[model samples]
Target: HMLHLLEQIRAYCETCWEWQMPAPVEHQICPAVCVLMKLSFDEEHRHAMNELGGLQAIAELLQVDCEMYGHYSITLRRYAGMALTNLTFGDVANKATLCSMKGCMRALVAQLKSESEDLQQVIASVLRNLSWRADVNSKKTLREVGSVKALMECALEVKKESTLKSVLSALWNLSAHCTENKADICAVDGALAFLVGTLTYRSLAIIESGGGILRNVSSLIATNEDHRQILRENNCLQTLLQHLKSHSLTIVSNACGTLWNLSARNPKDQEALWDMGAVSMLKNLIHSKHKMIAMGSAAALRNLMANRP
Candidate 1:
């Protein structure tokens, strides 16, 4: 009877770990911990972690036979990423421990290495945390974690099917929250190449988010000789132009805003944007029904005309 409680908890954790639904685990653990903390541990959950080998032990459970959990891989992957993310807070630089904590994520990455779209929701959440801590050190850490390249590889690997559609949707969420610098972005050569290649990616959502990331980075990177040189060498202007023609109005709006952001720093770059037909693109967006699109487009055009003198 006494072991029954722990067995139930263990079983719940097994299902949670196998299926990846951590919120339930969180809910279950929180109530029990709340009661325990009221009596013994106080409000700190770290005590439970310490009592249980902390997250290191939990991370190890991820590799436990997926067959044991059955049909909950998606759920497991989701919770697994969350659990590892939570563990990261317990200790920031613990790679072995974090790896275990991130076991489902690593599994997702391994399985979807070439083409798997199921992990995007879980992946996006992981990346949002990555974005909040965007810095050279943090960037280096994520690179080490393999998320940057893994995500990019998924995009390239999924180009043909409905898979690309789901991956792009994931990318939209991931990019919306991204705050990394250009130098950091440039670090992931594969990701950079993939984004640049999105000029040809069929999905409008992917094209737009890809353009926004470039614009975000371009806004951060001063037009130093090296940065400008890379842009030109990479044909970044032409790729941005393609996004301006994207099918989705959201993509079109974001692309125009991104262009405006990129050009504002260096009027000289206006030639680059103009050469790529950014002016015409913005002019077209001015007719958009959305006020945000119309305003961003009008503003881009105003800056363009003003720089002409």
Candidate 2:
């Protein structure tokens, strides 16, 4: 039964590009196509869907202008974006394949401006999934297309907690070891302030994702004094210390990681973290089951102790 549906999607992807579907037919077909991709969980099914030009089809659907089709186009892009997310899930090869497609990341980033929170959430999820692969090329492509600014702006306006989490996660991924992207994020007015606010979210998912962004940004501090100064000027240390006792291991770990990165070879940061009572918290985390948390805690403690004052 499912195979029949799969075949129909394959036929659609293979033939549907020749002509744009009317908005009504798009309303019917786009959801089904997205569902089909969502159900393709295992590697065999995932590869089959990829072979069916599923990536390209979804990209085309996303590139369509929502204004041209009225409200229906928003729904079309939402499911299409979700389908893109599904296609990339646990499939690194497909992620690279999607990145290779022209305008794919831009199309996904474009959806960030949509007034529909549903579409924005789904599009944010798609960008978040793509960033999970950490493909340097893909990150570069997303950066080139202004994803950081978009995610930063959306992070400010988005009211839904879940959507906020996805946007911050995408920012975290985009900021990873990419100095240019990190600079771009910092250049956006209030970007750091907004991220600092995210750390206070009641949702642990948002806290962790938001923490991840700071952790990445702090990575630039080792050599970029300006970056360190910005973090200090914004009083991010106090905000980070608030999460040291978070129940969520990820939140605690990320908080520790950010401190560790900031304190590396920087005596002022190390002593300040110690003064903030990070010494006791880092001692408590030294035995955490999560290896990253344990390591970050140990490293921060070492740095703090090295400059005991």
Candidate 3:
């Protein structure tokens, strides 16, 4: 009986929202799409849903004009965001397909800019899932479409911890090793500051995300002097020093790692970090039980000492 319902949901999705369907029918089918999204929590069912081409079909529903449908529009858009969020969760193979499917990334980015906190959280989750293992082309597409800017804005307004974590995770993924994407993140005024502020959140995940982003932003220095200067001007050195004492190994490791990156080749930044008392904290971390924390701390001190006059 359970398997039959799952197949029925998949079948309904494929048939109900084809090109010729009216807006009303599309709106009506949203509830069913959401039902499938719920069932997708089970790993096998998620794979099954993807096989039916339900991802593209659901992406199509996002194109309907919400203004024309009023409340129905809201319901459909909400569920659409929720559905995509579920569909993409831990499902890496389909992310490239979602990105390549003409209007999918665009629609998700559009939703990211909306006023609804609920919508922002769900859409951010969808993008986060899509970006988890994205390739160069998909990362470039995400950067071109203004995801960094939209996500930073969304992060600032969201008060929920779960939502904030999702936004931070997305930012972390987007900022990873992509120099252009890193610059875009720094370009959004106060974006880095918000990330810096994330350290103060009670959640360990949020703290780790904050440190992860700072670590990425610190990489920007090697490419452009302006990027390095941005970190200094933003008081990032001092913020990182504070996190160096965090009890969480992940936070401590990331903090030291960021300090290492910021101080890598630049004597001036190195001196600034040392002046903030990072050297002392780092020396202590050299003895840390956590392997990553100790290694990161040792590396930071080595760079700082090498650059010292």
Candidate 4:
């Protein structure tokens, strides 16, 4: 955690190790980068990293194409990738600095093209944190370059639940305010169905991520017919009703938002919502102490009643 030590490691990594040093052992890992990753677990370390140029240092390490050269340790690349991700966590400056690093985004996109699962998890999570509060241009660039489509196409094959969650959260951030991404998510083959499948994941975090994306995509139903149709046919509305009783405020709110979006102009679903006990469910939630949940429930109720025959 010492600033001096981090500087030393930074400089050491700058050398072209693959050529200067002999091949790393099969089990070899980057001890220096591993330490850097651990240092980032604490807030003090993250700030210290920013102060001592550790962010850029980590960024520089990640810029290496781990796949392009032999003797370049994939293990080290993963560690450095994880280190950069940890450094960027919750710090917009770190995120901005990482992004501003020349060729950093290009490095990330190049890594995304790899067939590595563990690496993909870290990359997806990095995107999640970066898009959380990073600049608008950051989101636009990623969306423009097909990360959205790539994530969609690969989501089903990611065997790890946590990895899948990261991918979904990245898309959620990608879709947060970008209308094009919302459509891109819906247009991806079977994406809507996979989101619906998350209801059965039985994990709150996974469902929250999935439901969050659904909330974003459904918000487009007001303007995108395909969004409405995909969700409507997938039983997204009725399925969301289950979460109206959920304890997690985010889950409840996401379900409410998606329900609100889906019922915008569909008379059949509107009446079905009333018959599904959503009126009573939402009426009680409007009294919720949490303003966001209450607002979402009330908004959903309004949508359900906006047009009733």
Summarize candidate 4's per-residue lDDT along 1-309 as a digit string, tens digits: 467656655555544444444333322336767787877788876777788787777666566434235224666677777887787777777776665554667677566556678888888888788778769666666765666777776687788887788888887777785778787777787888889888657548888888988888786665666655666777777778988888788899898788877767767678778888888888888988887788888888887666766
Number of residue pairs clashing in candidate 2, backbone atoms closer than 3 angstroms, sequence gap of 3 or more or interchain: 0
lDDT of 1 at 23: 43
Stretches of candidate 1 off by over 4 Å are 1-150, 153-168, 181-183, 221-230, 242-246, 275-277
- Estimate, for each residue in 1-309, the C-alpha lDDT of model 3 and write its tens digit: 334444544454455445324444543455565676677667776776677776666676565433223255556677767877777776776677777764557667777656577777787888888778887677878887778878877787788887888888999888884778787777777676677677666648988887787787776654556666666666767877888877777788788778777778777777777677777888987877888888888898898887776
Q: Who is ahead in lDDT, 1 or 4?
A: 4
The digit string of per-residue lDDT tens for model 1 on 53-167 reads 5344334444442324422444544455455445443344443334333444454445444222444544444454444434445444444556545565566555354455444
Q: Please give the lDDT score for candidate 4.
A: 0.73
Q: lDDT per model, in order?
A: 0.53, 0.74, 0.72, 0.73
Query: Cα RMSD (Å) per model?
Result: 10.1, 4.1, 3.9, 3.6
Worst 10 residues of 1 by lDDT: 33-42
Any residue pairs clashing in model 1, and if so which? Answer: 19-75, 19-76, 20-75, 20-76, 20-79, 59-100
Give the TM-score of each candidate: 0.52, 0.79, 0.81, 0.83
Model 3 score (lDDT): 0.72
- After TM-score superposition, the amount by which residue 71's alpha carbon in candidate 4 deviates from its true location, in angstroms, is 8.7
Which of 3 and 4 is ahead in lDDT?
4
By lDDT rank, best first, the candidates go: 2, 4, 3, 1
